[PDB]
Design a protein around this ligand. Structure first.
Ligand SMILES: Cc1c(C)n(Cc2ccc(-c3ccccc3C(=O)O)cc2)c2ccc(C(=O)N[C@@H](C)c3ccc([N+](=O)[O-])cc3)cc12
Lengths: 271, 10
């Protein structure tokens, strides 16, 4: 019908920009994880020694890592580099969301500030399984056991992301779905400190209809996938709160570690 | 939020 059509248009526009904005799709990640691909299988990192041997191979967008720190801290500086780049990818993606760039700039800031961690978690799920997580465009694979093995507080950092991911991955969402879900997360009218909620909520209501239509068309066998997904989005805010707490700890207790300025902006006065 | 601002105006 006429309204459906506009919502299908939004879904496609969003998928297109998602594909342009983010380097590694869920499609490719799964192909890499299953062993269903023509590419060279990822270098596995499971201890201090394998990290060091694999550091040569772990390029991201043609950026070579720098060639003396303990395992835990080096792992954290890498996840930090990737996060910064993700924030930048998510910001470009947000700008492609119709109506977002017409919002008050201070509110664009606030939506990103609170949205980015939720989205990062969502997109981590695409790269994870029970065994571990793909890194750096899928050239590496870091075992969950290894990450859990790190000295505290770093040992408890990735584990909740894994716990969330095994449950979220059950919904079997694909890239066309995720593209819409991510936009819905960004356009959340209840972020603290927003100035003008109404045009945010109007955009989110279209996005949510687009999401609902998308899930009916793309997963016609899946009963109320839409409702399940919305329940997960609410779990996920609690989980971002725990993570921000853990970084509060890490900033204070681990003085040998420079937290990147972009990330400081985001974590400051958050929960 | 100077960087975020800068990324948004970029
Ligand atoms: C541990 C790690 C290393 C050592 N590198 C290479 C690298 C290469 C270059 C540099 C580097 C670049 C510029 C300047 C200096 C350096 C430098 O060497 O220090 C640093 C590390 C990584 C690259 C990506 C990821 C990654 O995808 N992590 C997952 C968990 C993830 C985490 C977060 C997200 N996310 O969507 O936010 C997705 C996946 C992890 C690592």
């Amino acid at each position: 019908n006429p309204e459906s059509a506009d919502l299908r248009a939004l879904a496609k526009h969003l998928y297109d920009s998602y594909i342009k904005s983010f380097p590694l799709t869920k499609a490719k990640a799964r192909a890499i994880l299953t062993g269903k691909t023509t590419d060279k299988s990822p270098f596995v990192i499971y201890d201090m020694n394998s990290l060091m041997m694999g550091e040569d191979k772990i390029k991201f967008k043609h950026i070579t890592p720098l060639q003396s720190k303990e395992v835990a801290i080096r792992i954290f500086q890498g996840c930090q580099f990737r996060s910064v780049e993700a924030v930048q990818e998510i910001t470009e993606y947000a700008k492609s969301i119709p109506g977002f760039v017409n919002l008050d700039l201070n509110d664009q800031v606030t939506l990103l500030k609170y949205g980015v961690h939720e989205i990062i978690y969502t997109m981590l799920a695409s790269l994870m399984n029970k065994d571990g997580v793909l890194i750096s465009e899928g050239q590496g694979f870091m075992t969950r056991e290894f990450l859990k093995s790190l000295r505290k507080p770093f040992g408890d950092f990735m584990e909740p992301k894994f716990e969330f991911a095994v449950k979220f991955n059950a919904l079997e969402l694909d890239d066309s779905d995720l593209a819409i879900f991510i936009a819905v997360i960004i356009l959340s009218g209840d972020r603290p400190g927003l100035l003008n909620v109404k045009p945010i909520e109007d955009i989110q209501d279209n996005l949510l209809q687009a999401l609902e239509l998308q899930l009916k068309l793309n997963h016609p066998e899946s009963s109320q996938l839409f409702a399940k997904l919305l329940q997960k989005m609410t779990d996920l805010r609690q989980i971002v709160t725990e993570h921000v707490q853990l970084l509060q700890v890490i900033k204070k207790t681990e003085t040998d570690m420079s937290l990147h300025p972009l990330l400081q902006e985001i974590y400051k006065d958050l929960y | 939020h100077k960087i975020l601002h800068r990324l948004l105006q970029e």
